[PDB]
Amino acid sequence: ADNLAEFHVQNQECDSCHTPDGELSNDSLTYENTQCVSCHGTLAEVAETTKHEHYNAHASHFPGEVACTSCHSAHEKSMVYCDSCHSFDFNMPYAKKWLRDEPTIAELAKDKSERQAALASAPHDTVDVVVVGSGGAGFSAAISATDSGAKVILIEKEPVIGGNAKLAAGGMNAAWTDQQKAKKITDSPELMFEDTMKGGQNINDPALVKVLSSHSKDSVDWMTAMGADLTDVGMMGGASVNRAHRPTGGAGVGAHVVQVLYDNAVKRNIDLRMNTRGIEVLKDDKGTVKGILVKGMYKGYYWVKADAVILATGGFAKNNERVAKLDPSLKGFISTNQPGAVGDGLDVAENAGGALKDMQYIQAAPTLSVKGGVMVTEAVRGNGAILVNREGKRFVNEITTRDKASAAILAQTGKSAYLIFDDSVRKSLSKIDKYIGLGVAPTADSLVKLGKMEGIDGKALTETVARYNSLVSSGKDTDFERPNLPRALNEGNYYAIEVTPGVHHTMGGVMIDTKAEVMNAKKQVIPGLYGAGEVTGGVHGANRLGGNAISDIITFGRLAGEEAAKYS
Ligand SMILES: Cc1cc2nc3c(=O)[nH]c(=O)nc-3n(C[C@H](O)[C@H](O)[C@H](O)COP(=O)(O)OP(=O)(O)OC[C@H]3O[C@@H](n4cnc5c(N)ncnc54)[C@H](O)[C@@H]3O)c2cc1C
Ligand code: HEC
Numbered sequence: 001a002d003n004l005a006e007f008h009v010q011n012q013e014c015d016s017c018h019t020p021d022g023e024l025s026n027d028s029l030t031y032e033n034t035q036c037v038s039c040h041g042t043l044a045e046v047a048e049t050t051k052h053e054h055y056n057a058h059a060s061h062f063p064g065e066v067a068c069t070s071c072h073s074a075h076e077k078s079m080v081y082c083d084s085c086h087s088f089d090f091n092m093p094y095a096k097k098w099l100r101d102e103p104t105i106a107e108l109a110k111d112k113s114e115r116q117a118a119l120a121s122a123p124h125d126t127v128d129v130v131v132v133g134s135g136g137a138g139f140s141a142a143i144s145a146t147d148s149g150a151k152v153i154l155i156e157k158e159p160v161i162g163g164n165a166k167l168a169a170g171g172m173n174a175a176w177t178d179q180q181k182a183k184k185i186t187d188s189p190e191l192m193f194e195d196t197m198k199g200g201q202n203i204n205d206p207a208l209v210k211v212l213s214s215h216s217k218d219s220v221d222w223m224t225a226m227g228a229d230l231t232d233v234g235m236m237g238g239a240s241v242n243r244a245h246r247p248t249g250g251a252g253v254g255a256h257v258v259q260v261l262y263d264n265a266v267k268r269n270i271d272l273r274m275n276t277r278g279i280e281v282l283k284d285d286k287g288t289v290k291g292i293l294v295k296g297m298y299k300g301y302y303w304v305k306a307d308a309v310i311l312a313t314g315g316f317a318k319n320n321e322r323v324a325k326l327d328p329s330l331k332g333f334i335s336t337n338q339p340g341a342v343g344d345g346l347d348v349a350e351n352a353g354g355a356l357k358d359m360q361y362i363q364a365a366p367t368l369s370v371k372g373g374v375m376v377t378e379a380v381r382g383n384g385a386i387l388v389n390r391e392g393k394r395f396v397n398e399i400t401t402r403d404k405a406s407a408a409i410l411a412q413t414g415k416s417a418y419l420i421f422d423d424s425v426r427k428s429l430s431k432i433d434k435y436i437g438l439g440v441a442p443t444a445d446s447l448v449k450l451g452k453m454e455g456i457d458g459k460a461l462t463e464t465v466a467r468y469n470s471l472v473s474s475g476k477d478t479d480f481e482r483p484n485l486p487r488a489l490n491e492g493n494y495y496a497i498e499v500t501p502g503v504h505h506t507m508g509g510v511m512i513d514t515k516a517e518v519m520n521a522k523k524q525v526i527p528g529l530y531g532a533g534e535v536t537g538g539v540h541g542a543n544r545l546g547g548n549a550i551s552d553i554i555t556f557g558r559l560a561g562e563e564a565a566k567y568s
């Protein structure tokens with residue numbers, strides 16, 4: 001057969017997958033997927049039949065309930081969503097190579113036809129607030145608005161939830177939490193403010209950072225009340241003390257927090273629609289929003305009538321064309337991001353009259369795995385790893401800010417470097433076992449052997465770690481002034497990961513005030529329109545601190561849903 005449907009119909013009726021009238025249930029294909037699961041079992045149950053030692057298409061790090069049709073289309077060949085970041089050895093029936101080419105909001109102007117018909121019709125729904133994007137900001141807004149008495153619809157343009165937020169692995173910053181106190185850490189919202197402003201080269205909007213620092217503990221409290229584990233507290237670059245919260249043992253914070261938010265949304269019966277792209281904010285004759293035009297992948301264009309629209313669409317770091325026009329030094333770099341993170345939400349915001357700010361400020365993650373092409377968290381350095389070049393030497397304070405660390409690595413021989421650590425660092429952060437499982441962390445029982453394996457001067461590497469361990473025990477790094485020296489690298493085997501910077505986060509975006517209201521260039525509020533999360537500009541200035549994005553998206557997402565409900 002040439003497609004999955006043709007296969008099944010050899011022995012099955014159309015109504016084995018379809019509804020009686022044969023119309024598709026909705027853009028989430030809820031009915032249809034339910035049919036796949038009635039015959040094949042849950043994703044979990046299927047996974048039992050497709051195990052590989054180090055990977056499984058049906059049991060991945062993605063949170064929520066991933067629909068079969070995310071990867072298996074019926075009447076045409078389809079793509080494995082995992083192939084957008086990885087190249088595992090898969091044999092999916094009726095597969096085609098991964099290719100993403102989603103038309104821009106401006107290209108969608110060619111559907112004048114269909115769009116006019118949709119706006120001429122009745123609104124398909126009339127609700128209080130529509131939230132665009134199912135990452136951390138969007139789920140937070142949806143839940144908090146629902147808790148304040150609003151009726152909400154949450155839309156996601158991708159087949160899966162979570163955006164980039166499901167990928168976060170270092171932690172969520174907050175001060176001064178019960179969690180920190182339990183770990184004997186002393187901190188304060190003021191100190192977090194100070195670190196953040198200084199880290200952003202004082203380009204940050206001080207009113208927005210004051211919201212970020214002052215609300216941070218309550219956001220950790222809010223998430224924990226919903227069931228999250230944020231009790232591990234680690235160090236990230238540019239911070240005066242440990243304040244990056246994450247699940248016990250140093251597991252990834254992203255997947256976890258998104259799963260908690262998803263469970264809480266399902267608990268509240270929130271209307272979540274997948275494969276549903278927000279296209280155009282609609283305004284009444286006085287300029288306040290009145291609804292939003294959306295495009296369903298399977299049911300087409302329709303609009304929703306609502307008093308408020310909350311844009312929670314994420315950044316544009318996957319769009320290297322737009323990145324390179326703003327910062328040419330990042331042209332051609334690999335990105336850490338999900339395939340959808342291309343900035344179409346910003347375009348929707350601008351078309352509604354929102355201004356943009358700080359767009360030229362774009363952050364590279366210093367340590368993308370060269371071998372795996374995926375992000376390696378800053379927590380690996382925060383928990384004790386060092387960086388060495390091919391010469392086998394240290395060359396940078398490994399917990400300085402991301403802009404300086406990226407430049408340092410790029411300046412080394414071959415424009416890459418190596419994370420070096422031992423089993424004491426490995427056991428302190430369980431996320432590291434995930435890198436080892438990916439195959440990107442070669443290991444050996446001695447640095448001379450490791451160096452020969454990886455093309456690092458083995459003798460110089462050995463002396464480099466002995467010297468580093470001596471500064472650790474003597475409590476001061478006189479070589480690169482690293483201010484926190486948590487562990488000696490001296491237990492068990494030794495690991496190396498080859499790393500180079502990758503495009504990661506866009507600090508600029510839609511201009512918002514402290515109530516998450518979107519503003520135009522005249523600094524006037526657009527009534528009804530809100531922005532929260534990486535789509536916004538002004539929170540992080542010229543350089544974002546690791547851990548501060550997850551913090552931002554919960555605080556501003558929650559704030560925005562509450563303001564939108566009150567606006568109503
Ligand atoms: C690999 C990785 C690791 C990171 N780790 C950390 C960490 O440890 N700590 C930290 O603080 N930060 C971390 N960051 C940054 C942080 O995860 C992101 O900034 C965060 O994802 C921003 O969340 P958000 O809700 O704003 O957007 P996202 O989580 O990206 O969600 C936005 C959603 O909107 C959808 N969308 C976009 N346009 C439309 C549209 N027109 N219609 C409908 N849906 C739309 C997108 O597809 C996406 O699902 C990490 C980022 C990455 C990529
Ligand atoms: C389940 C294994 C399927 C079988 C068997 C058939 N269809 Fe299907 N169809 C199914 C889904 C998951 C979808 C979504 C798109 C995709 O290819 O994955 C579809 C869609 C159609 C459509 C499009 C509806 C629209 O665009 O509004 C039609 C016209 C359709 N399918 C027809 C149809 C007929 C007549 C079938 C029996 C011969 C049949 N389908 C089987 C999944 C499955």
Ligand code: HEC
Nearest residue numbers: 007008012016017032033035036039040068069072074093
């Ligand atoms: C039961 C009535 C089924 C429905 C509804 C769907 N599938 Fe199915 N599928 C079914 C059988 C009996 C078989 C053969 C293997 C077996 O279980 O005995 C299959 C096969 C497939 C395959 C393999 C195709 C190939 O070329 O080998 C896949 C990938 C599969 N089915 C996927 C799938 C999806 C995603 C469904 C919903 C859209 C779905 N199936 C519906 C039984 C049934």
Ligand code: HEC
Nearest residue numbers: 036040042043050057066067068070071080081090091092
């Ligand atoms: C992408 C993330 C996928 C989603 C979600 C689902 N499937 Fe899948 N499926 C995918 C791949 C890459 C493969 C190949 C596995 C490999 O290791 O090479 C599969 C395979 C199938 C098959 C074949 C299993 C067999 O009998 O050999 C089945 C029957 C199957 N998929 C079913 C299925 C169902 C019903 C899903 C929803 C619950 C589903 N898959 C999700 C990729 C992805």
Ligand code: HEC
Nearest residue numbers: 054055056057060061082085169337338374375434437438
């Ligand atoms: C890019 C945005 C990603 C997509 C799409 C998928 N994965 Fe992923 N994967 C991602 C990262 C950044 C990492 C590094 C380790 C971490 O936890 O952050 C990984 C790692 C894996 C691994 C190794 C560790 C493990 O969980 O076993 C596997 C086996 C893996 N990813 C599988 C996987 C599958 C099956 C996916 C599709 C459903 C998938 N990943 C998509 C980033 C990205």
Ligand SMILES: O=C(O)/C=C/C(=O)O
Nearest residue numbers: 169170377378546547
């Ligand atoms: O784990 C990291 O590298 C990511 C942290 C950040 O992007 O905030």
Ligand code: NA
Nearest residue numbers: 507508534536
């Ligand atoms: Na931004």
